[PDB]
C-alpha cells in the first residue's frame, strides 16, 4: 500500500515541517512513513511532521481532550516532545484554517499544554507568541569548539542548553566562525546539550548560532533562543527584559520574566498538496 | 501581486525537481524565484526546476519550435544542466500527462534536442531511456582522494569526468569509503572535474559514488554513470557493452555503442500541489 496524503509545507524561522491534517484520527503514521516523507530528495523534506489531531485521540495525552494536539514526529521517526518553532507553525495552521475561534488558545503536546497568541496571521504568514516557561539556570560550565574554550550558562528550558555569550563577538565574526560539534562537560550534561554561541546584548539584540544535540547546526532552535536571551541578559546584569535574537533562519523576540518567558516569531505556510508514499 | 503556481515534485534517482506547468508560457520565472522555490527549508526544495513549455516560447531556443522544451533551471537559477537526470523526469511528466502521444519522442533542451523512449509509465513512476550522445573519451589520468591515488578514464559528456575504476574495491568497501574533494591533475583538468569512484564490472554491474564539481557528493549523476560505464568497460579491455550502474539514488542501465550511448533509469512523481510566490 502506497498511500496518498494531503499535506502542507511550512516553516518557523526555517525550521521546517510537513503538516498532515487528520482531524478524524484516521491515519496511522508510522516511523518508517515519517522518515520517507521527511527525506528531502526522495520525499517532501522536513525537520519533522506535525500531525493535526484532537488530544482525545492521542492515547496517554495528559491534557484537556477538547484541545488540538500537536502530534510531532522528528524526521528520524522518533516521537518528540515540543518544538519552540514548530508550535508557531501549528498555531498558525489552526487559526488560519478556522479550527480554533480565538487569537489566544491552548495546544496540547507531549510536554504538556502550550499557550499561544496569534499577533497577526493570514493563510501564508503569521506572527505568533508562545509561552516557553521559567528559564532555569542550572549553573556555569564551558565547552570547546574546534580548540577554543567558551564559558556559558547552563539553562534548562525543558531540554538542556549551554548558552555562551562571547565578549568581543561581532555578527560578522559569528557568521565567519567554523563550527564543529562541541566538547563539553558530560557530568554537567549527562544527556547531551544544545550549544548557543551568542553575541553580547547591543541595542536590545543579539545574534546566535546553535549546535543542536544529535543534529548539528540548525537554522533556528526556539528553546535555544530563550536560553541565549537569558544568557545575554545575565551578561548585561539584568534579570528580566526583551531581547531580539537573530538566528540564521530569521529573527525572533524573547521576553524573560522572573516567572516565565515568551518566544515571538514568524510562521510561514509555503505549499499545499498531496503526496504519495510507499 | 502574488501568484499561486500549480507544481509537482519528482526525482530521477533522487536528483529531485519541482515541475512547473506553463504550457501557454505565462509565467516569467526569474532566477530569484527559482532560488526561493528550491530552498529546501524556506521553500519546496529541489536540485532544480523543470518548467513545461513549448520551444517556440523559450528565448534563444532554435530547435524545432513545436517540441516541448525542458526549461531547466538549477537551484541557484542557472540555465546550464550537468547530469542529465532531469530529462527522464521531464519525459515521464509529458507522457503520463498526455502532452505527447507516443512512447518515443524528442524534447528540446538548452544542450540541443534529446531523444527519449518510455519503457513504462504511470502517473507516479516510470522507466525511461535517454539518448546520451557520443561519449568523448579523453584518456587516462589520476586523482587523489584523502591520500589515496586512483587511476581513471577521462570522459567529456558535455562536462568533464574522471571515472576511476578501482580493482579489488567491493560495493561495501565503496560505501564505507570516506570521500573528500578530489585533487587531480590541473594540467589535464584546468577548471576541475566530476569524479566517479567505481567498482569493477561484476555480473555486468558496477557501484559508483560521485563528487560533482563545486557540489560535493550527490545521489546520482546521469552523465557520470555513462562515464563510469565507459571506464568500467575500458578497465575490462572493452569499448562497447551494457552496464548496470548502482548509485546511492538507485540503479540505472547504460549502453555504450561504438557511435553513441543510452541511459535507462527510473523517474518518480511524488506530489502534486500549489505554491504561492511574489510575481517578478
Residue numbers in the entry:
A (entry chain A): 1 to 278
B (entry chain B): 1 to 280
Task: Pull verbatim passages from the article behind this deposition.
DapF (EC 5.1.1.7), a pyridoxal 5-phosphate-independent amino acid racemase, catalyzes the stereochemical inversion between l,l-DAP and d,l-DAP. DapF plays an important role in the biosynthesis of l-lysine because DAP decarboxylase only recognizes d,l-DAP. Each CgDapF monomer consists of two distinct domains: an N-terminal domain (NTD; Met1–Asp131 & Gly268–Ile277) and a C-terminal domain (CTD; Met132–Thr267). Two catalytic cysteine residues are positioned at the active site, which is located at a cleft between the two domains.
To reveal the molecular mechanism of CgDapF, we determined its crystal structure (2.0 Å resolution) via the single-wavelength anomalous dispersion method, using a selenium-substituted crystal. In one monomer, two catalytic cysteine residues (Cys83 and Cys221) were oxidized, forming a disulfide bond with each other; in contrast, these residues were reduced in the other monomer. The formation of this disulfide bond also caused a large conformational change in the loop that contains Cys83 (Ala75–Gly84). In contrast, in the oxidized form of CgDapF, the loop was positioned 5.8 Å closer to the substrate binding site, compared to the reduced form, resulting in closure of the substrate binding site. In contrast, in the oxidized form of CgDapF, the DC-loop interacts with the CTD instead. The disulfide bond between Cys83 and Cys221 is the main contributor to the stability of the loop, and the side chain of Thr223 forms hydrogen bonds with the main chain portions of Met82 and Cys83. In fact, no reducing agent was added, neither to the reservoir nor to the protein solution used for crystallization, indicating that the protein was crystallized under somewhat oxidized condition. In particular, the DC-loop of the oxidized monomer makes a close contact with one neighboring molecule, whereas that of the reduced monomer makes no contact with any molecule. Under oxidized condition, the position of the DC-loop occludes the active site, which inactivates the enzyme.
